[PDB]
Design a protein around this nucleic acid. Structure first.
Lengths: 349, 349
RNA sequence: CGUGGUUGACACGCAGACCUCUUACAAGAGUGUCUAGGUGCCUUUGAGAGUUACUCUUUGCUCUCUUCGGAAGAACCCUUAGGGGUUCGUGCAUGGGCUUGCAUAGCAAGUCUUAGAAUGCGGGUACCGUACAGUGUUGAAAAACACUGUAAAUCUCUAAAAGAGACCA
């Protein structure tokens, strides 16, 4: 009752409505979960390692998580020329990555579902939902809810930013999901869904577990990029490529904010191995094993921890995490073909 | 080659692209046709008698016409509370009316198809169409194409005016129709479909046969109303009710424009009986049989034809046209039940 | 609207409504049928929590005294008769002195008279006569007396709205 509650609360960052959370846990121990993402070319580390940690923690807590491959949404967002073959190949490649990274597939906990085959076979349970959603909306209300696709309002506004919010709001009920979690880039759609469900009056609102966006390799981009390699670390680069991509990141000396490495270690390395060993030499003071995150920041902001000892350890940890994925992609032929087919096309941004 | 061309051209009013028309007639003698309407409560005379004349002329010319019962569109437009039972009952009632008015059903020319059962069974051939349509659109471009539902733009704009145009544009290919015809209240959707098909580049554009909207019983409403009885004549009123509804219409003495009776006789009575007998007395000059429409206007705008001789003849013609429908609804039990169930609920406007 | 009918129904001079007929919309005709409403009080009003995916605000439903007393009048249970417990109606602008945009008096804004209830209506309250459905009496048909309900049935019967903090083609 309390341990599962704390484990579920540890998944998200800006949690809210704890009473609703405990009520849904007491009335439904095994809920349904999913995630909404936009497949486009390759996957960065935030959509890979952090999502794997999140789904593993939800499985350990007793929550069923489903995979939502968004191909129709990707075609609506105009990516890779709107072709279906390229987008479905990217989706299969992302599924292969999530399967090779370490997913509990044999236990029947994870379920992969494509949007096309799910909406095509259940259009009778999907058209009334989007219809009733579009009925209780307004022009400016939907224009405000156009943050998942990209820019706000003062830009080249297209009609795709009108079809996307209604479908994204209907997906929370079309997939019979009890609770769902994404990030902070969907707050307008969240409040629109809240207003619509209050206007129609149903059961109990799910719990939102928004994840903070990870900044790029330089002081400017606050999100992750799946097109430009000099913005985020992918899930298939070699050791040398990962080292080159990690040694060019913005790392201010002895500064907390503005450095993405702290958030990377907090939401990528710490929940995985449940520890953090700083690989140093015999003259620096030896190896330090950090079990949490407060002591690491306290030692880094005191004058005894330099990036010259944090970047090599982080790169070694990333290489050790990627080694199973590389081995699985090398020992298999279909995974190698998928990798060679996705590492050739263009990725729009 | 030429006679069929003239017959097809006589169906519509503001015809265009005669070369495309003759090319499609020479390359496809038997095309597929349909009509898009919004069932809501009861049907007026324009959607009944004129549509029956149009489909009969298309059948005589050698064109297959299909019936498109729009129930999902009616639920999207928010009519009769959005209920499905009432809308499907109204659709069955309209089908019964079109069958009792005199439709070539035994010849296999007319085909009734509901939108729900057609899109539900063929969603795999319908989702890609609307997807590719919504991809090549813009916000303001779809906002402009919101004239079928009702008001223009400066009003309470909802998201239904965004889902309606894309579906209406996709219906021209989802129903494998070679040519289609509606009216002038769909020009924005027509030009949007033209732009989309020019962007994707397919075969040859169909021929548009827009029909002029019939004004109401008073100088103001230019369209037909299916809610207020004092605006149009239905297809089930008794002789006394039809006479009361026709004797209260706006009829300016010796004025061509602004009088709906001229257009009613032109597009309802003239193509039916192929004549028009003016029932008069022995002191007025006798009965006059008009075979066309120019001589009728010339005699009315000269001082020898008064509405006191045109309104009774028009009412008698309408009663003679409605007598088979009344007889079919009286001799049958299912038709009577449908009539009693549709003449009790409310009709929104 | 007054008359004969002691009163009400019943006809006449006039208006409106239901229905029908004639008529070019307009309009005319047919009583075939019907027709004041008041007695009566309140209502501009903290905040939080909850009502199938953030924060805040104006707003739809329940719990925390529901801020002049909050349920105002009715309803339910106990009453030597004063009372003891619960449910139902959550409002918009102006104003009188406060200052300015106006050098001092149209129009608006920061605050006070919880509500000037002062100016208007949105909504409920025991009751009466008209018309209707049921009972007993007076009753030639018709109609009247007292009892239950209607004139706004009314409450989203749960089909209910909006704006600022936002990473695409």
């Amino acid at each position: 009752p309390e341990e599962k509650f704390k484990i579920v609360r540890s998944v998200g960052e800006e949690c809210i409505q704890e009473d609703e959370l405990l009520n849904l846990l007491t009335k439904k121990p095994e809920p349904v979960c999913y995630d909404g993402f936009e497949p486009s070319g390759r996957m960065h580390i935030a959509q890979g390692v952090m999502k794997t940690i999140s789904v593993n923690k939800l499985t350990s807590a007793g929550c069923r998580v489903k995979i939502w491959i968004a191909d129709w949404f990707a075609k609506l967002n105009n990516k890779m020329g709107g072709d279906l073959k390229k987008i479905e190949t990217v989706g299969r490649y992302l599924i292969e990555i999530w399967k090779a990274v370490g997913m509990d597939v044999e236990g029947g906990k994870v379920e992969f579902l494509w949007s096309s085959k799910e909406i095509n076979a259940r259009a009778d349970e999907y058209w009334p939902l989007v219809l009733d959603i579009a009925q209780k909306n307004n022009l400016k209300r939907i224009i405000r809810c156009s943050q998942i696709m990209g820019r706000s309002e003062q830009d080249e506004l297209t009609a795709a930013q009108i079809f996307y919010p209604c479908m994204q709001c209907a997906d929370i009920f079309f997939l019979k999901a009890d609770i769902c979690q994404l990030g902070m880039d969907q707050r307008k759609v969240n409040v629109l869904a809240r207003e619509y469900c209050d206007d129609i009056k149903r059961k109990n609102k799910p719990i939102i577990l928004s994840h903070h966006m990870l900044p790029g390799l330089q002081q400017g981009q606050e999100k992750m990029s799946k097109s430009d390699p000099s913005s985020s670390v992918f899930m298939e680069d070699e050791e040398a490529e990962v080292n080159v991509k990690i040694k060019k990141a913005y790392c201010p000396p002895k500064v907390v904010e503005g450095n993405p490495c702290l958030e990377y270690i907090k939401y990528l390395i710490l929940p995985w191995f449940n520890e953090f060993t700083v690989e140093r030499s015999a003259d620096n003071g030896g190896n330090k094993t950090f079990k949490s995150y407060e002591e690491l920041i306290a030692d880094y902001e005191s004058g005894e921890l330099h990036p010259a000892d944090l970047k090599p350890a982080l790169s070694k940890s990333l290489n050790k995490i990627l080694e199973p994925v590389r081995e699985h992609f090398r020992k298999d032929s279909n995974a190698k073909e998928l990798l060679k087919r996705v590492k050739a096309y263009r990725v729009t941004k």
